[PDB]
Amino acid sequence: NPLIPAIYIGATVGPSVWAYLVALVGAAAVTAANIRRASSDNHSCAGNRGWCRSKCFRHEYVDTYYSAVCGRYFCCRSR
């Protein structure tokens, strides 16, 4: 129902997630929404403030907004 999410925009997903967003739309809207690829689902998001790890520490959390660009992992951040 809901079209592509805004997180992928100006974000940075991995190789598997990238190919996914492409199928939903196409390499055009995928390259126009400002989407960067990373070594894998684990990458940095929300600018140089959050990162992606299998899980996050207690003093940190999971930016529910960028949890998408992450994929199987979770983009944790500092509140």
Taking the C-alpha atoms of residue 39 and residue 78, their distance in angstroms, rounded to an integer, is 23
Which amino acid would we find at residue 19? A
CATH no., domain 1-39: 3.40.1620.80
CATH no., domain 40-79: 2.20.20.10
Q: Where are the domains of the chain?
A: 1-39, 40-79
The answer to whether 4 and 68 are in contact (CB under 8 A) is no
Ordered DSSP codes for 31-42: HHTTEEE-SSS-
Q: Is 27 exposed, middle or buried (0-12, 13-18, 19+ CB in 10 A)?
A: exposed
